[model samples]
Target: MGHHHHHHENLYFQSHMTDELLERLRQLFEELHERGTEIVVEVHINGERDEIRVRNISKEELKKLLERIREKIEREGSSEVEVNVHSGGQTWTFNEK
Candidate 1:
């Protein structure tokens, strides 16, 4: 048998609000982790917004996580900004704003 898979997929969807909120209000990540979600988002920017760590939730609950992430952000934020994200071991920066 032969193995096959689909490529050219934009794994991340357009969550514009999150791009700004998560980049600024980092505690959101910690709060979510505390709230019992399978997400561990660690944020730290350098020069141009870098080093965002994501784990446990990759292709599985990514979309759901966006809403959840955004949900947390909205309750605290009231404006637009920017963002980035990466999976540990390898970088997966979400520079989509």
Candidate 2:
């Protein structure tokens, strides 16, 4: 008996937010860019679920960035605002070309 290896191209997708955290988001985005990191895409998951996706960002930085954005949003945005994070398989982009 013999076995064959399976190979597939894998892409990872992660999510954050910007809908209610626009101001802080803009700031974070600028910081990421200045740090020479690339924000791959942002998605509006639905009416209330929006996300900011980036690459080359460590787990620590990602967590810190999200924390800052959430803090700012909570301070200025409505108390009803909610946010989440997840990992999946897909390729999404900000601009179309």
Candidate 3:
């Protein structure tokens, strides 16, 4: 008998997802330390609903963020890769299989 959020996800795909995910993650965290910025890197996944959250929505850092994510998409290959920015009532996304 089980009582909870029964997730049928396997570790294999989770690992695969995090492969490119953490790759992109490391990039973000490193730069966050650039200007004495603190951070919290949280990564999670559920089917196609995988995602990670960081310290703050770095709007000022958006320029390179978008650029880097773009490059990663081209070189990484996959429709599951994306970056979502949400601060207050603002939301922006860089996503395309």
Candidate 4:
């Protein structure tokens, strides 16, 4: 058997945003999808905060991946940002209601 570290989240609230902002965010996801990028997005909407974790399978690519996302978040007026990049495969286990 292989050892794995798991990440879990209890609950999350959807972010409140202007229609334009929501559109832009959707556009971002669409672009990422088009580029063959799979993203892990953790958002705390009630707190107006977000945590974006990237899985690039490489340190350099992960760094660049987050940098680009940060730029978009900044453009959309997100005051706080938390970026995470995992160097290896990770396990995330959670129970949802």
Candidate 5:
């Protein structure tokens, strides 16, 4: 008698995002969380952009950031300013609700 077993394959896609772009993503995520705003972030790569929708900014092992960008317009009593991150490798776009 012979015994046979089958195993399932694991397949998933991961981002090849550059280090610089990753840093920007983290920054944006924290910024929105601190501001108490909900965010929907879009990551652009190779002329294609994908969306990452994270409900809780405080959660660990997340795939997206950019949640605090809509809660408050000003910080440290400073004037309402616009913050932007420009990277040639990728781009991050965000929105509030």
Candidate 6:
């Protein structure tokens, strides 16, 4: 008899949005975080981009970040936005029906 084992890390996708669509994206991340899933988000705005590693922060920190995003949404408003998410080599689009 022989034994075989394999290990692989999860792959996260990046997104760029300059429009008001970020509010929708923020909602997605918030829901995913609540489900206890770790995700990496790269946000592009005003010619600057920031990488947010959600799993590295504590629940409290995540909550604060969500609040900040909510504030941005309140001031900026949002529309129906579609985005493609890549995970495990599969791509799925997130959008409202």
What TM-score, computed on C-alpha atoms, does each candidate reach? 0.30, 0.30, 0.30, 0.28, 0.36, 0.35
- Cα lDDT tens digits for candidate 5, 1-84: 987796554435324333344456666556555543335454443343444454544533233233332222212222323334
C-alpha RMSD in Å of predicted model 5 compared with the true structure: 14.2
- Choose 5 or 6, whichever is better by TM-score: 5
Quote model 2's TM-score.
0.30
Candidate 6 regions off by >4 Å?
1-38, 42-51, 80-97
Q: Model 6's lDDT to the true fold?
A: 0.45
Separate clash counts for every candidate: 1, 0, 1, 0, 5, 0
Please, what's the RMSD in Å of model 2?
13.7
lDDT of 4 by residue, 1-97 (tens): 9787866544332333433444444444445553434456543322454555554333333333434444456565454443332122322321111
What stretches of model 2 exceed 4 Å from their correct place? 1-50, 74-77, 89-97
- Runs with alpha carbons beyond 4 Å of true place in candidate 5: 1-17, 59-97
RMSD to the true structure for each prediction, in A, is: 12.5, 13.7, 12.0, 13.7, 14.2, 12.4
**Residue 96 CA error for candidate 5 (Å)?**
24
Give me candidate 1's TM-score against the actual structure: 0.30
lDDT of 2 at 22: 40
Give the distance in Å from residue 13's predicted Cα in candidate 6 to where it truly belongs.
Answer: 31
Over the stretch 19-41, how does candidate 3's per-residue lDDT look in tens digits? 46544544544555454233422
Model 6 lDDT tens row, 35-86: 5444545333334334445554444444444344444444544443334433
lDDT of 5 at 22: 48
Q: Which candidate model has the greater lDDT, 5 or 6? A: 6
- Residue 14 lDDT (model 6): 26
What lDDT tens digits, residue by residue, belong to model 1 across residues 55-84? 544343445445555654455443342333
Q: What is the C-alpha lDDT of each candidate?
A: 0.41, 0.45, 0.42, 0.41, 0.41, 0.45
